[PDB]
From a paper:
structure of the strand swapped dimers is unambiguous. similar to that seen in the mouse PB3 crystal (MmPB3, grey cartoon). mouse PB3 domain behaving as an unusual strand-swapped dimer. crystal structures of the human (this study) and mouse PB3. monomer, with the multimeric forms dominating.
Numbering used by the authors:
A (entry chain A), B (entry chain B): 890 to 966
Amino acid sequence: SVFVKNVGWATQLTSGAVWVQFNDGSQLVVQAGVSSISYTSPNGQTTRYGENEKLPDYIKQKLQCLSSILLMFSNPT
Amino acid sequence: SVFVKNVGWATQLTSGAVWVQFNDGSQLVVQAGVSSISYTSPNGQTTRYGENEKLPDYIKQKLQCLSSILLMFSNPT
């Protein structure tokens, strides 16, 4: 019935937003925020962080790799 | 210094989770929840929804198109 035509997002450090445009012309803008962060070390100890907890520097630099901006367009003919 | 090797996510209607694995073996699991939803109709009237607010059926069916599960692997040699 209804499907996606164009998408795009911009994710910051502690939140993100997704923009979507459908075939019928409607648009959906979804704002999302981080509720919890889980980090398992390479040797196997797990550590969960909360919505308000402070993040260490070596965790922040790894979270920076997730921050990105995407754009995709349906390009017929 | 540190970059991403494998990613994956599973998005529900009002939230989502992203799984990421780095080259050094570390893993990041990010839980996110929707804070606000903006819907502009094809003719142009906007409507904003809240973090907890209920959604009409024609909004839920369009949000269902966003729900997806992705998985990506780095495949050297």
